[PDB]
Amino acid sequence: SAEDKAAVERSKMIDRNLREDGEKAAKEVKLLLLGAGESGKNTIVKQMKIIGIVETHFTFKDLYFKMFDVGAQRSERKKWIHCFEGVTAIIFCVALSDYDLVLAEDEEMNRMHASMKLFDSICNNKWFTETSIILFLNKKDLFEEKIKRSPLTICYPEYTGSNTYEEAAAYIQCQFEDLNRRKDTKEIYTHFTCSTDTKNVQFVFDAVTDVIIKNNLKECGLY
Amino acid sequence: LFVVITFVRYNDTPIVKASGRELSYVLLAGIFLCYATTFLMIAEPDLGTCSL
């Protein structure tokens, strides 16, 4: 085995490179991105980037982020979403302007209820138990402009508030967060964003940091 | 002993989680031993007592 010693040398070098790259990747945080069509995920992804699967890389005070845009896949989500089980954040983008819109090529299913149904299917999927959902109620401005005339009762017939913006968006947040059944373990970080220089990158950074610390305190049984 | 039996019977509430559990039990047993040092000192010097 005079030559096979060099083979073992190659194996050890490859193992060393494997371990270094693996620790480098496990250093980084993986964030899913999903939502209805035209949910305004383009504006959100543009804001974080300024600061098949579409992978987008950004940094916010180290803790280098890799973001995975999945909307591109028109296929069976059941056999695909068994991946991404190790993501420490699931950025869900939904546009509040969807409440007024009757259709998305889907038999006059209201786009808001279609988004809630997708949220129900993805949040309570038994693959994702420790992964936390970051909820971007996007286009808060266009919602504020629409709610002034068209009552949310067209979307949520049991709503009895005065259609004032705060009492409407608080209801949408309450409903989306109550749609999460396994609230004992999961956390929903609801935030309101629009097409402007918000803290949405800072808010993602803070929510991801908190989820990381929560995960580590579970690792040692401190939490 | 009271604090020990409080953690032992409340070994699952999030504040005993925050206390780190068994590392805190090690600390509190250390306090117990540091207390028993006093009981050991007042005894007759003898031979074993001075060693302990």
Side-chain angles (χ1 to χ4, degrees), chain A residues 1-63 65-223, chain B:
Chain A
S1 70
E3 161 165 320
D4 290 350
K5 306 190 308 179
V8 159
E9 286 293 326
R10 311 160 190 170
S11 173
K12 300 307 179 32
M13 291 269 198
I14 288 184
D15 172 306
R16 153 192 311 299
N17 297 336
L18 270 164
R19 153 254 306 287
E20 306 285 290
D21 184 20
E23 83 94 41
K24 169 58 54 173
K27 202 75 69 175
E28 299 161 7
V29 290
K30 283 185 289 178
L31 295 87
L32 249 187
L33 161 74
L34 85 179
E38 203 165 19
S39 54
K41 65 162 60 179
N42 301 75
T43 293
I44 298 291
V45 72
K46 177 175 182 177
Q47 290 167 324
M48 311 77 53
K49 183 174 174 300
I50 285 301
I51 309 302
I53 276 304
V54 202
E55 305 182 40
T56 303
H57 302 239
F58 54 89
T59 300
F60 193 19
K61 295 166 287 192
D62 306 341
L63 179 136
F65 305 80
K66 300 198 302 296
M67 178 149 178
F68 307 121
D69 189 9
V70 195
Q73 295 295 100
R74 321 318 335 127
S75 148
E76 182 59 85
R77 213 183 85 255
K78 148 181 72 162
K79 293 315 187 66
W80 175 324
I81 204 47
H82 80 247
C83 314
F84 310 110
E85 63 282 60
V87 294
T88 315
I90 302 186
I91 297 183
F92 197 108
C93 291
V94 61
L96 297 174
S97 59
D98 290 335
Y99 88 108
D100 197 65
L101 279 291
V102 175
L103 180 71
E105 312 302 331
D106 55 351
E107 67 170 26
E108 303 189 346
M109 178 23 48
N110 182 294
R111 215 181 319 294
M112 187 57 28
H113 285 285
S115 306
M116 294 179 55
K117 183 166 61 73
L118 182 176
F119 187 94
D120 203 326
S121 270
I122 186 50
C123 175
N124 299 50
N125 175 337
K126 75 64 188 158
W127 294 123
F128 303 143
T129 279
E130 295 85 357
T131 75
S132 320
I133 294 186
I134 297 174
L135 198 44
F136 276 131
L137 299 183
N138 207 11
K139 296 186 179 183
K140 62 168 284 176
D141 50 340
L142 185 59
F143 180 78
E144 183 175 11
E145 278 269 40
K146 268 184 157 64
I147 193 64
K148 285 181 293 176
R149 64 181 185 55
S150 188
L152 187 61
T153 311
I154 71 194
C155 181
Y156 297 160
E158 71 305 349
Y159 178 75
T160 43
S162 191
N163 297 293
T164 186
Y165 166 55
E166 295 287 358
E167 195 168 65
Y171 190 42
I172 299 161
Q173 167 172 11
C174 184
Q175 180 168 150
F176 267 104
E177 293 182 359
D178 200 13
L179 196 182
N180 158 242
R181 273 142 43 210
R182 317 183 291 137
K183 198 148 53 187
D184 185 352
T185 293
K186 291 198 47 141
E187 311 77 354
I188 311 296
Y189 295 79
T190 309
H191 186 229
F192 297 95
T193 50
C194 48
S195 290
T196 185
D197 193 9
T198 52
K199 337 276 202 308
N200 58 327
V201 190
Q202 170 66 35
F203 169 78
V204 162
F205 157 84
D206 203 308
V208 167
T209 299
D210 180 55
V211 172
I212 288 164
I213 287 177
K214 164 92 173 195
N215 268 16
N216 287 357
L217 298 183
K218 241 52 84 182
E219 172 80 20
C220 56
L222 269 175
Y223 210 115
Chain B
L1 85 85
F2 190 79
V3 185
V4 166
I5 218 65
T6 298
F7 294 153
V8 163
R9 195 50 177 263
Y10 295 104
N11 199 37
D12 55 10
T13 196
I15 290 180
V16 309
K17 308 286 295 299
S19 302
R21 299 210 295 189
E22 185 158 28
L23 183 62
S24 183
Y25 287 56
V26 174
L27 199 164
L28 186 55
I31 286 169
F32 178 93
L33 190 66
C34 195
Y35 268 123
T37 294
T38 289
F39 267 23
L40 180 80
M41 206 55 268
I42 52 193
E44 189 174 22
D46 298 332
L47 271 182
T49 302
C50 286
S51 300
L52 283 166

